[model samples]
Target chain A: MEVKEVELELSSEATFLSKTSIGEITAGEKGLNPMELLLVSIGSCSGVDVYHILKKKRQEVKDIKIFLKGKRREKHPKIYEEIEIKYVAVGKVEEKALEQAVKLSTEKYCSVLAMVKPSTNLKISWEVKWEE
Target chain B: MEVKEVELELSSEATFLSKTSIGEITAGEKGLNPMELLLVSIGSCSGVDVYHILKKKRQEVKDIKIFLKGKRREKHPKIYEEIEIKYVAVGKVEEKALEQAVKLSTEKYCSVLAMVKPSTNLKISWEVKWEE
Candidate 1:
């Protein structure tokens, strides 16, 4: 049983300074809003998994970019109803490898995605782009 | 209908540079991990709500700190099974106002918490502190 803890201080009404195990994150006016952070959580979580998996599989991956778009309902407690994630892998990586890694991430390893999957409509797309 | 979008680039295997609507965040060695970002999402979401609700109620709040502890299950996804949140209000804030605001946020206004509520065991504790 692993317990992960984080502390966030709202120094101002709109600024949040968070201390986490890996490092610190400031989310607010000069960083991110709560809604944006949620998108980030999904993107980073899945991105990390795919990146590491490709590395392990000996894929020549130079960079990975995760683009996420979320649609929120116009009501109080506006949660995301639809989300689209596009993964662009820049390197001499194989298309099959990129697809496999992304599949494994969203279906198995990414906890954030798993949590949100039960409620949100999630769509994923992946591509391998060769860097010049 | 509102749409929120964010982009995260993994410049390094462990570092993520994110471009969000509010601002930019670097999450990695000098920033935060994926799991920690999830916690920050909840804390900031709820904290922002409480802070704004207090202000609307004419409460004198200098600062608000949100502390979150998440216990992840030892499984494939390692999702959070239990989460506890503590809110500390600094300044001359009324206790009743703090409780009302927190309740409203968690029960009504916080979209992140609402997303996680179905699967996670959540606990809430709050207090009002006087600043010297």
Candidate 2:
């Protein structure tokens, strides 16, 4: 498979002071807040993997919400001590299947999670709701 | 001290897919990556506190850079187990003064850092380069 590189430029004078490029989107503003961005990054990275995994298993998902919480040091660099993320899904998937999908994302998939895990706690959990 | 609230609207088709508002800077994409944003938030939160403390004590600062590292668990909720931050500064600030500034930030100055320090192991270190 051929992977492509994306580039983005951010300036202080524009409507959005920051920019990120993934080839598909060019220069402009980054639409995420500082804290929310972290959650989104982790969530989206894992979400993609989980979504694909569930899709392959023929699971029907109505909605998914990922909640992230982190503990930061109260000093310079203010690093995170812990980050907790929970995935809430409204769907008709078996618990075992959902667990497998999550496992794949957190362990074998989600490169972003892998990169940060070596230095952080990186806990993941899942809950599914069946629509009746 | 007075606190203020800011509001912003983000568009799906905007140049930047993310949006953040701080009252002063209204409606624009955020200018940082998810990971970088995390570190930046920690850096800036502590930076402001350190800057103000040093300013009150008449310290001269040429530049400051904060480095952050984290360890994440390979599980759901992807929590951080440990985090480290290093502060590098170029200036003529005395060692005692610098240490004091850092202590203040970690202990009482930076609110964000304090908010996130309870759940993980957070470490901080500093290096100063005196100007010629």
Candidate 3:
């Protein structure tokens, strides 16, 4: 297992420059806040998984778009009480493959989803538009 | 309840440009990998809680830096099995208040910590570097 460390500048305005594994992320009003980043992690993790699964299954995927919405609880530690995801695939994909890919990602592969599942409810929907 | 949404630009090389609430995060080899971003979210969320709590407790804090290391499970999902965090603080902070601030952050106010706590084991330590 590889270990990764992310160092932060943690500047004033509560903004930060994240020295991450992939690269450096300069965050502030020009970048994602912590909460927004969390939401992105959810979609990105699953996106990587589903993309790989469909590719291995011989599906032709032209593009993928994930629309995510999260509802926060009313409290000091405002957490995601519920999350909804819509997977839009513009490709030549199998219906069963699409469904199974998402199910596997949310239930088995997406670590972010698994982490948040204990406290947050998750819902997913999908639509596949074939290539012309 | 407030709702938040994140959209991604799933470009080649698996790079994405994230449109987030706080701002836009352009991700790539020049930015953060999805995994690195996840790790950052952990520290940032906790940092927010501890910072706020210390201020509320009337502790004079000059600087804060969190060093975190994570061990991942050697599996397909590669989820974090254990995480260790070291909090280095510079200021005229009360030791007891310092301890409680972290405790509250991890056990109460840190939503990211709470989300990951169920599946990931977390350990935290701290030191106060007095300011002149």
Best model per DockQ: 1
TM-score of chain A of each: 0.91, 0.77, 0.92
- State, as a TM-score between 0 and 1, how close model 1 is to the true structure: 0.94
Candidates in order have lDDT scores of 0.85, 0.53, 0.76
lDDT by residue for model 1 over B1-132, one digit each (tens)? 698889988766556898887667776534568788999998988888887899999988888888999999898798998999999998999999999999999999998888888878899999999874
Lowest-lDDT window of 10 residues in candidate 1 chain B? B22-31
Model 3 per-residue lDDT tens digits across residues B1-132: 988888876675445567786656655333456667777787777777777788889988787777778787888577778888877767888788889999998888786677778888888898888895
Residue runs of model 3 more than 4 Å from their true location after superposition: A26-31, B26-31
Q: Alpha-carbon error at A22 in model 1, in Å?
A: 4.4
Tens digits of per-residue lDDT for model 2 on B5-119? 1221222211122222421221112322333333444455566566667768787876655556766655544444566776665688776777888888888766545645665
TM-score of each: 0.94, 0.49, 0.89
Whole-model lDDT for model 3 versus the true structure? Answer: 0.76
**Models sorted by lDDT, best on top:** 1, 3, 2
lDDT of 1 at B57: 90
Kindly give the stretch of ten consecutive residues in candidate 2 chain A with the minimal lDDT sum.
A6-15
Q: Relative to the unseen true structure, what is the C-alpha lDDT of residue A120 in candidate 1, on a scale of 0 to 100?
A: 81
Summarize candidate 2's per-residue lDDT along A18-101 as a digit string, tens digits: 222211121122332333344445555566566667778888866555566666555444444567777666678777777898
Better of 2 and 3 by lDDT: 3
